[PDB]
């Protein structure tokens, strides 16, 4: 009648409210005084499905609910095995799948077995009734038999099917509705709380053991590990135990010696080092390529600009009358615009941040260059809150001084996506870079951008000398040689050009470094 | 009598009428609308006849001949009852579901599949061959008529075809009355339940989809986490409708309208009364089959909100809003495709109002190296002028931030009774609008009041509404100074 009486919420952490939805949709109508259920006159639910992206443990729900319920063990369908060459057999395997169930329905019908089936990877078996997916031969259309058995003329109130997909929208319109597939819900990339809980479950057995997980600080590990989830999250420790014990297993010879040492601890710094080896679904790890030497604080301007950054961040975070906010930061060439647009994200600490740039796409036609952007901003809308960067507008919408030339579809898509807010409750930040703003004025995008920043470049020696005390590579003698000549010069130049010229000038000679530095600096400026 | 269906008297009477001995009854439309309950009711209401549960493609067998053997065995009426009992009148009925897998155009379709995999000929020929076996009746339920309708119909055998599936915006009350009958008779249902109140959110939410929420409203009350009985409240219904179930909803609007409409002066009242006058012009007049207006404003004053307000103010069957927000990237031809699609939807509806927002960025206008989408322009311009067939009527209201280009390209003449939206006129309007919003209070209002009259102000409210926020975030001391600094920065 009732489940095995031993569940006690074993197996899962991070998905609590969705499993509560599973209770109150599936198990409620079962677990109640059945006399009063006759007083209700409600038929039980069949047809759960789970359309989560890869990972996130949908399969484990599909296993643990079967562990819970007390009935004949569910007849797994390990993807398509019903298909066979002889037509009619593919269509007819399902009757064998449902036969015992409808037998228990008819004979001994009132109190029943409550049989379940898992029916994994519907994306293979079901399609858009054969119209789509090329010319799918009528062997493909076993959906018709399935439909007719689950909600056709003969009806079943004793069995429930489950579904599991990575691409739900490919399913036909028919099945997803009530009576066939009553409940649909994603399994999302869990928050920090759920990630802590799941990591706690995997580590718990070792922590229980006296000699393991010393100084591991799972809460620190959680806040460190941003988008790791599910299978990736537990594969982390599945690699960390291995890194911990490779120390012991090799001592490279025929026999492998670890016998004396069974005191293994699985230290923290192994897991921290291990974090490097797995790569998550979102390619956000490689910040360095954008910021290779970081930001050195020279003068007040960088402070002021980053203050505006945090101001703007907390603005969108707090307000609801601007769910969207849009700003470029203008500068002359080689002034660290991309980097200083990344650092504001690092300060913002938002969950979903992405940098759209031509660096990602090098030779894509304007149309694909638009649809990629569309994917990015759709994902940002799909998140609750986010920060998008558009690096080198000048390059995304192609721009050349000779004649007026650019791709206008890129610009139209971008401008529209600026004015288009996300849905109710969602919020957004969008930020852009460009070495050119008079162009954007000409083509009327600087209107759409809500505000602006003019990031400077190095203007005078009282900035340059402190910037040069930063970034090392120099000492007081070269500094004194410089300071008199530079002070009069009052150079105007950009930091990226600086950081390049310094390296090439210094390469030549231990003595003759300044004689090249200033000699080439004569060119730029004045 | 109509019980368990509760959807509609229309089809329950119309299928029977001009039918009842007929052969070939076929039932189609979108999925749902109780096409199975039709059988489950009428087979019983008729003279105690076998339902003949049949599972559609089950006839298919791997062996040769057994496929046809099944369906010739199945009938069991032409054999004996044609003569037996002195009846010459049968009652046997055969019901098939998901006939698409069983039938195709002439057998060669979806792969030129073989002769014994595809034999429709047996059933095509039984009725129109040796004789019309008119002692029985067939029911075919196809939820995907497009596949089989084109090539499987001959009139006299299959002339019958009836689309089914309207929401029945009052009959869904009658529908759910059945499945709530027991909860009402039994003392479960609430007193605060307004059944029309809960069902009027169900415009496109079909009666077939309209039992999951009822199971959920029962079940949320049942819900016990990790006693009290019979607590079937009403609280569950609105949460069920908003979150667990939404289907074939196909309705998205009223997100361009945001923060409401505020009468910050006589111009807003003026333009809204003008739009009211114009919709009445549409409604109460012949020889004005289509009306076409453009409202120009400078940017960030807000015009899409105004257009959507004019739409929502007036009850219509058909309203739709054309923006690039949905069709970014869709090239010059797909854009006009979408546009003529929604205008054909309008031409089908009997009375409608369509809106276009921001044509300046719909038709891809850029000032430098001026270029645009010639084709979507020239399609839109003729759509402004293309009247519907007869007697139905159309409105087309347009926004843009720039009408000089339109005057230059002659769009302006084609538009009718254009209008002008202003910026914020002066600081009086500005500060009374601030106090109307309620984001500022009287002290800082008075503080702002010092520098109002000395300088005139030409600003859009969308920009104002964005602009206030960063200052609000800023501390109360440096709030007003920063606000006024930005206001003197822009619009001097």
């Amino acid at each position: 009648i009732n489940p095995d009486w031993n569940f006690e919420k074993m197996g899962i952490g991070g998905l609590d409210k969705e499993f509560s939805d599973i209770f109150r949709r599936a198990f409620a109508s079962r677990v109640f005084p059945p006399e009063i259920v006759e007083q209700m006159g409600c038929k039980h639910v069949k047809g759960i499905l789970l359309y989560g992206p890869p990972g996130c443990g949908k399969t484990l729900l599909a296993r643990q609910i079967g562990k819970m319920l007390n009935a004949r063990e569910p007849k797994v369908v390990n993807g398509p095995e019903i298909l066979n060459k002889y037509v009619g057999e593919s269509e007819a395997n399902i009757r064998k799948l449902f036969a015992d169930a409808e037998e228990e329905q008819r004979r001994l019908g009132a109190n029943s077995g409550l049989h379940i089936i898992i029916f994994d990877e519907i994306d293979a078996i079901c399609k858009q009734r054969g119209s789509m997916a090329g010319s799918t031969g009528v062997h493909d259309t076993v959906v018709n038999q399935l439909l007719s058995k689950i909600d056709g003329v003969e009806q079943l109130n004793n069995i429930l099917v489950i579904g599991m997909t990575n691409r739900p929208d490919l399913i036909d319109e028919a099945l997803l509705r009530p009576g066939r597939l009553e409940v649909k819900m994603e399994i999302g990339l869990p928050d920090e709380k759920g990630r802590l809980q799941i990591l706690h479950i995997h580590t718990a057995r070792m922590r229980g053991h006296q000699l393991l997980s010393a100084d591991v600080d799972i809460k620190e590990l959680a806040v460190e590990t941003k988008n790791f989830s599910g299978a990736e999250l537990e594969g982390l420790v599945r690699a960390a135990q291995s890194t911990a014990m490779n120390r012991h297993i090799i001592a490279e010879v025929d026999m492998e010696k670890a016998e004396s040492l069974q005191v293994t601890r699985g230290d923290f710094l192994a897991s921290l080092e291990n974090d490097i080896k797995p790569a998550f679904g979102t390619n956000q790890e490689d910040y360095a390529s954008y910021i290779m030497n970081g930001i050195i604080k020279w003068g007040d301007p960088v402070t002021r600009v980053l203050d505006d950054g945090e101001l703007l961040v907390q603005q969108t975070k707090n307000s609801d009358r601007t769910p969207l906010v849009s700003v470029l930061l203008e500068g002359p060439p080689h002034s660290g615009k991309t980097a200083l647009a990344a650092k504001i994200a690092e300060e913002s600490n938002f969950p979903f941040i992405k940098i759209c740039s031509p660096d990602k796409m090098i030779g894509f036609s304007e149309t694909a260059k638009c649809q990629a952007m569309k994917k990015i901003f759709d994902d940002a809308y799909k998140s609750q809150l986010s920060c998008v960067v558009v690096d080198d507008i000048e390059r995304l919408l192609d721009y050349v001084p000779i004649g007026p030339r650019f791709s206008n579809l890129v610009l139209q898509a971008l401008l529209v996506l600026l004015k288009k807010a996300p849905p109710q409750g969602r919020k957004l930040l969008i930020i852009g870079t460009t070495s050119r703003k008079d162009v954007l004025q000409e083509m009327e995008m600087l209107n759409a951008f809500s505000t602006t920043i003019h990031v400077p470049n190095i203007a005078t020696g009282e900035q340059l000398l402190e910037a040069l005390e930063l970034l090392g590579n120099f000492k007081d003698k070269e500094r004194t040689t410089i300071a008199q000549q530079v002070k009069g010069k009052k150079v105007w130049i950009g930091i990226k050009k600086l950081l390049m010229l310094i390296e090439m000038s210094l390469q030549m000679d231990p003595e003759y470094r300044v004689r090249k530095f200033l000699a080439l600096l004569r060119e730029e400026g004045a | 009598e109509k019980m368990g269906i509760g959807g509609l008297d229309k089809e329950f009477s119309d299928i029977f009428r001009r039918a009842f001995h007929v052969k070939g009854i076929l039932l189609y439309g979108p999925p749902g609308c109780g096409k199975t309950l039709l059988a489950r009711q009428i087979g019983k209401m008729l003279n105690a006849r076998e339902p003949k549960v049949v599972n559609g493609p089950e006839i298919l067998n791997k062996y040769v001949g057994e496929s046809e053997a099944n369906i010739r065995k199945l009938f069991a009426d032409a054999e004996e009852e044609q003569r037996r009992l002195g009846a010459n009148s049968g009652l046997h009925i055969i019901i098939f579901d998901e006939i698409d897998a069983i039938c195709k155009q002439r057998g060669s379709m979806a792969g030129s599949t073989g002769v014994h995999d595809t034999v429709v000929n047996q059933l095509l020929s039984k009725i129109d061959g040796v004789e019309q076996l008119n002692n029985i009746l067939v029911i075919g339920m196809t939820n995907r008529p497009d596949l089989i309708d084109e090539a499987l119909l001959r009139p006299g055998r299959l002339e019958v075809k009836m689309e089914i599936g309207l929401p029945d915006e009052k009959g869904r009350l009658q529908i759910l009355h059945i499945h709530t009958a027991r909860m009402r008779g039994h003392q479960l249902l609430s007193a605060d339940v307004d059944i029309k109140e809960l069902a009027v959110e169900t415009k496109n939410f079909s009666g077939a989809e309209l039992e999951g929420l009822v199971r959920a409203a029962q079940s949320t009350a049942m819900n016990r986490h990790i006693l009290q009985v019979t607590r079937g409240d009403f609280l569950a219904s609105l949460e069920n409708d908003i979150k667990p179930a939404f289907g074939t909803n196909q309705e998205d609007y009223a997100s361009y309208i945001m923060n409401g409409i505020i009468k910050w002066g006589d111009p807003v009242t003026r333009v809204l009364d003008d739009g009211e006058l114009l919709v009445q012009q549409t409604k109460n007049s012949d020889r004005t089959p289509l009306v076409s207006v453009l409202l120009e404003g400078p940017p960030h004053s807000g015009k899409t909100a105004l257009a959507a307000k004019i739409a929502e103010e007036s009850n219509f069957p058909f309203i739709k809003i054309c923006s690039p927000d949905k069709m970014i990237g869709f090239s010059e031809t797909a854009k006009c495709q979408a546009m003529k699609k929604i205008f054909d939807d309008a031409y089908k509806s009997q009375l409608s109002c369509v809106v276009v927002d921001d044509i300046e960025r719909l038709l891809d206008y850029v000032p430098i190296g001026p270029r645009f989408s010639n084709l979507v322009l020239q399609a839109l311009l003729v759509l402004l002028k293309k009247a519907p067939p007869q007697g139905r009527k159309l409105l087309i209201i347009g926004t843009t931030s720039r009408k000089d280009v339109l005057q230059e390209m002659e769009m302006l003449n084609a538009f009718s009774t254009t209008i002008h939206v202003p910026n914020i006129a002066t600081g009086e309007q500005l500060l009374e609008a601030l106090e109307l919003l309620g984001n500022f209070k009287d002290k800082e209002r008075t503080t702002i009041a010092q520098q109002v009259k000395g300088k005139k102000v030409w600003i859009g409210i969308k920009k104002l509404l964005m602009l206030i926020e960063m200052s609000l975030q800023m501390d109360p001391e440096y709030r007003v100074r920063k606000f006024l600094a930005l206001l003197r920065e822009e619009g001097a």
Binding site: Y86, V87 | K62, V64, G114, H116
Partner: peptide, 17 residues
């Protein structure tokens, strides 16, 4: 062209008495 029209067929005879 519409190349790569590669298609597969199924047994439906299963000749047996």
């Amino acid at each position: 062209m519409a190349e790569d029209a590669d298609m597969r067929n199924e047994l439906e005879e299963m000749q047996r008495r």
